Write a protein that binds this ligand. Structure first.
Ligand SMILES: C=C(C)CCOP(=O)(O)OP(=O)(O)O
Ligand SMILES: C=C(C)CCOP(=O)(O)OP(=O)(O)O
Ligand SMILES: C=C(C)CCOP(=O)(O)OP(=O)(O)O
Ligand SMILES: C=C(C)CCOP(=O)(O)OP(=O)(O)O
Ligand SMILES: [Mn+2]
Ligand SMILES: [Mn+2]
Ligand SMILES: [Mn+2]
Ligand SMILES: [Mn+2]
Ligand SMILES: [Mn+2]
Ligand SMILES: [Mn+2]
Lengths: 362, 362
């Protein structure tokens, strides 16, 4: 177990705690409390909950093989649920600001938060900042007396920082590094020389993999008091690997999955992003295809966007994706086997996370 | 002490630490390091440094009367400087996002960060988020082994949260509370019924007073290991009082101090903000002046803005400001006298902070 039901139930508790505290300590009025309730629901719910449920499933794995009083088992499961919501609220923060930064129109099948009629960008920027503050309010309330509090806060903040650095790498990925200058308007690259696997990998490593895979796996270990029982270098390597594959999927779906299924409308082509599709197309294309790509990439013009998507389709990128995927399967399986040496239970949790990631269709 | 020189010197050290870590741990390239260096300098420097120097001056007060080895004195002064930069970087974060939210054009005598040619709003939103992450990176690096670390992080996060709540109160201050609704476009108030002292005071309490006065005073106590030696209810009361007066000054200057001296261009009238000027004018005006105010407030139109400023000038608000100020002087002096009972040294630091605030011209 009922993991998803327990996790969703704890959302109601955290929300009530936060909103009750706003009334009792922060002098909030009922209508602004309602606004923040709706904001919380809209930005924190309706996703796949993969990050939060990873914390829960890692914790459940150790519960199955560790001797505990039932009260202790309930405490660990509750801590796992609260920690998972910390990551889901961190996600909510990033998506609110990212949708503004990327000029997006839909998220989770609804308008992006900033596009809601009674929201607008000026309030949505601050709403996003509130979401991140709530992660810390949660931590200090629910975990005040826990032995893992310091480790958890330190990990959370380093992951949050890495993600913000990665967002800088992402939103500057269509500029030439040598021309970056706050004082000079930034032209889009014309040579696309920095659309390389290594540079792509750096964006993804920081913007996605720490908070989507490393943070939930290690938080599950922390609330289980089990971190010392795994090889942390393997956790870092497998989180980076699965997290990169997760983003490659997201890049592919941005272009080729209908918004009806995906729940968002892709902007990577029009935004000139350094996506897996663009890097891989450039790793394959002949001279004429590169020049045609350059003539059309990074423009909102729906007909130029359409030229790019046809170039992608005719370049048979499904072949590159399959070879990349087959390589990731080898390496993920190898790392899971290595994890089994010290931590069979955690290895299985990583196998579950991989299976969920590998099979996802949104 | 040479307090200002020590404090500015520590900026260079923190900056080098942060940028060196970006190179050694976060795979940053030189041009993006340069961008973030310039971003740090532009957003963190050039203010009055009142918040950071409050930490230093509180710590210096206890140094003068406490027995310490010189090495311990140097450690406390360095911690005070690092903690002061934590608050200055928090300030930097708020100003970067606030200038976007308020549609402002100038800050500290230069263009707002988001208006720099090679910046733009999409990167500036994330740059602001980086500034806040840097406050935590600082804390965990410099204070990892300090006994005050947990208290400091908990205080910092609660203050940061209060400020974000206050920014919500601020950016929604021109809407009718009963009509707030994320799903419905928000009309500006027509009755201005929520332009009251009590509602004004709530905005200011949260958006300004916690991070501008409470946080620097208590951080000075924490790095001095002296918090138990003061009456914290008095610290809270005097921080709220001086912080409110500080914002009333800022509201007055928004309208009446030339940008050449102030270093920013006011937006409160055009933004329909609940400012001290608007609340006090409405506390004084006759029927015709209220209707003329309503006809002109909250519009970028330079001639409508000019109508409001003339209404302010003819309403003799200098009289209300002087009575308000005379009341604050009574109450601040009373709280300083009360603080002397347990903590003469801290009372004097608060007297210094008050004098600096009271005499400021920007
Ligand atoms: C890192 C990326 C690509 C952001 C979207 O993440 P998810 O696809 O996990 O979004 P939700 O399930 O939370 O909606
Ligand atoms: C949001 C973060 C931090 C990483 C994912 O970036 P994207 O910008 O690719 O995410 P989507 O908008 O595609 O979900
Ligand atoms: C709280 C307000 C009114 C923001 C500006 O603060 P300051 O007037 O202290 O700005 P700097 O000295 O840091 O430039
Ligand atoms: C920035 C914060 C959090 C409070 C001061 O608000 P203002 O919006 O009045 O500040 P200025 O732009 O006048 O400096
Ligand atoms: Mn996006
Ligand atoms: Mn993005
Ligand atoms: Mn995407
Ligand atoms: Mn402002
Ligand atoms: Mn403002
Ligand atoms: Mn102001």
């Amino acid at each position: 177990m009922a993991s998803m039901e327990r996790f969703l139930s704890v959302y109601d508790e955290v929300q009530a705690f936060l909103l009750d505290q706003l009334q009792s300590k922060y002098e909030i009025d009922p209508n602004r409390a309602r606004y923040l309730r709706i904001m919380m629901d809209t930005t924190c719910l309706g996703g796949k909950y993969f990050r939060g449920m990873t914390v829960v499933n890692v914790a459940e794995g150790f519960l199955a093989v560790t001797q505990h009083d039932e009260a202790t088992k309930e405490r660990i499961l509750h801590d796992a649920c609260v920690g998972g919501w910390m990551i889901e609220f961190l996600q909510a923060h990033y998506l609110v600001e990212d949708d503004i930064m990327d000029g997006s129109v839909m998220r989770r099948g609804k308008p992006c938060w900033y596009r809601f009629p009674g929201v607008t960008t000026q309030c949505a920027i601050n709403d996003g900042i509130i979401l991140k503050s709530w992660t810390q309010i949660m931590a200090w309330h629910y975990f005040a007396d826990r032995p893992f509090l310091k480790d958890l806060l330190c990990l959370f903040q380093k992951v949050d920082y890495a993600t913000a650095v990665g967002q800088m790498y992402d939103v500057t990925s269509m500029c030439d590094s040598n021309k970056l200058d706050p004082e000079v308007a930034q032209p889009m690259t014309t040579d696309f020389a920095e659309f390389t696997p290594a540079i792509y990998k750096r964006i993804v490593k920081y913007k996605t993999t720490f908070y989507t895979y490393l943070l939930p796996l290690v938080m599950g270990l922390l609330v289980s008091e089990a971190a010392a029982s795994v090889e942390m270098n393997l956790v870092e390597r497998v989180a980076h690997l699965i997290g990169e594959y997760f983003q490659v999927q997201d890049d592919v779906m941005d272009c080729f999955t209908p918004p009806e299924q995906l729940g968002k409308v892709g902007t990577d082509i029009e935004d000139a992003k350094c996506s897996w599709l663009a890097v891989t197309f450039l790793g394959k294309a002949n001279a004429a295809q590169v020049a045609e790509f350059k003539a059309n990439y990074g423009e909102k013009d729906p007909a130029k966007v359409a030229v790019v998507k046809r170039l992608y389709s005719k370049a048979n990128l499904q072949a590159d994706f399959a070879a990349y995927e087959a390589e990731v399967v080898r390496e993920v399986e190898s790392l899971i086997e290595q994890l089994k040496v010290k931590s069979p239970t955690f290895a299985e949790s990583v196998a579950v996370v991989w299976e969920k990631t590998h099979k996802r269709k949104k």
